[PDB]
Curated annotation (Swiss-Prot):
The chain holds residues 1 to 400 of 692 of the full protein. It comes from Bacillus subtilis (strain 168). The modification Phosphoserine is found at S189, S278. Keywords: Cytoplasm, Elongation factor, GTP-binding, Nucleotide-binding, Phosphoprotein, Protein biosynthesis. Transmembrane segments: none annotated. GO terms for cellular component: cytoplasm. The keyword rRNA-binding does not apply. Belongs to the TRAFAC class translation factor GTPase superfamily. Classic translation factor GTPase family. EF-G/EF-2 subfamily. It is found in: Cytoplasm. Residues 9-258 form the tr-type G domain. The gene is fusA. GO terms for biological process: ribosome disassembly. The lineage of its organism: Bacteria, Bacillati, Bacillota, Bacilli, Bacillales. This is Elongation factor G.
Length: 376
């Protein structure tokens, strides 16, 4: 007998798109640490400043596999991590274009800034050249290599400094004098880019009226959600610098379940096109996306709930296979523990115990209102 701890609007289903060379694993470990306060898990339930953040693990393929399409549906937004040295590899391009097809909003994080030969401006440049994406910097790093001392937030128009310790973050002081000219130059470039995404901001810009910090964030978000803009951040996941800012950007610019289109399905035995809105008032529907052999509970079946709610110990239909399944226990895999929940809601992710015939890609739904989300 529990209600939602976190609302739809305050939910972030994210995935991290990057190669092992770009530092995907080390980046992921930092996110799990900051989001789990007070071996690779298929999906990790976590939080950040009052928001539910589900970190969905993604594969490292270089092909047009069906597993990626499913991995892109399960997540709503994504964090594309680039290597500061190389920038954009030929294999990052194939991943990027697939995300664009399914309309996945993405923020970019230029990792390994403290590494030798790291160049932020260069890396940002490759996105517009190679990928042909409208990527823009919302940050400017203070120094490179071991001189990498801090990060400038172009939106808030402030600077943060890192002592390279466990404390890491410091208060938001004024931008250093030697970086002000470039900072305002990039901030004004950012403001112009955003003005082209919302006419209301263009009008204020042309009339000479100031654009507030929140108006700029809204514009960036609006553009990022429409897959027309890609905010670019910087940091060093290896020495823990700028990772918390990425989490802030997830809240600020990545979509909540309601910010992406309602998922499309079909009624079994017919060609009828159906849509399931991301809401609790609708009939339950969910997509299973990973079956893991757990050592304690034996067999976990991870699933993304698109619509409705589901109580533990209740039946549902595996519409893909035409079988009844009893969701015995519902678990959420946290960073350092497991939580058994009595109810899972729309736009959330959990693992069901007790399923017999369900496999990756199958649809689980309310027995009284059937739907198959994946084509077969
Ligand atoms: Cl940070
Ligand atoms: Cl909706």
């Amino acid at each position: 007998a529990m209600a939602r701890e976190f609302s739809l609007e305050k939910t972030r289903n994210i995935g991290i798109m990057a190669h092992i060379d770009a530092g995907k694993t080390t980046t992921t470990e930092r996110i799990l640490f900051y989001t789990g306060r007070i071996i690779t898990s298929a999906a990790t339930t976590a939080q950040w400043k009052g928001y539910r953040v589900n970190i969905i693990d993604t594969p490292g393929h270089v092909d047009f596999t069906v597993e990626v399409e499913r991995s892109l549906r399960v997540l709503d937004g994504a964090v594309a991590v680039l290597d500061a040295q190389s920038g954009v590899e030929p294999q990052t391009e194939t991943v990027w274009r697939q995300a664009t097809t399914y309309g996945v909003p993405r923020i970019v994080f230029v990792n390994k800034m403290d590494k030798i030969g790291a160049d932020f401006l260069y890396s940002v440049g490759t996105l517009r050249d190679r990928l042909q994406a409208n990527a823009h910097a919302i940050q400017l790093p203070i120094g490179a290599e071991d001189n990498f001392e801090g990060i400038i937030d172009l939106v808030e128009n402030v600077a943060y400094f890192y002592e390279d310790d466990l404390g890491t973050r410091s208060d938001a002081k004024e931008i250093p004098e030697e970086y002000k000219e470039q900072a305002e130059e990039l901030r004004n470039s950012l403001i112009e880019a955003v003005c082209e995404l919302d006419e209301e901001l263009m009008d204020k810009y042309l009339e000479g009226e100031e654009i507030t910090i929140d108006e700029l964030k809204a514009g960036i978000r609006k553009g990022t959600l429409n897959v027309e803009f890609y905010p670019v951040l910087v940091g060093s996941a290896f020495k823990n610098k700028g990772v918390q800012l990425v989490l802030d950007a997830v809240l600020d610019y990545l979509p909540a379940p309601t910010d992406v289109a309602a998922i499309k399905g079909t009624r079994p035995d017919t060609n009828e096109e159906i849509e399931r809105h991301s809401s609790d008032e609708e009939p339950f529907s969910a997509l299973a996306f990973k079956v893991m052999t757990d050592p304690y509970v034996g067999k976990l079946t991870f699933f993304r709930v698109y619509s409705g709610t589901l109580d533990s110990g209740s039946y549902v239909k595996n519409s893909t296979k035409g079988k009844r399944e009893r969701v015995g226990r519902i678990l959420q895999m946290h960073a350092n523990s497991r939580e058994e929940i009595s109810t899972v809601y729309a736009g959330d992710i959990a693992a069901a115990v007790g399923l017999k015939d369900t496999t990756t890609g199958d649809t689980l739904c309310d027995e009284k209102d059937l739907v198959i989300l994946e084509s077969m």
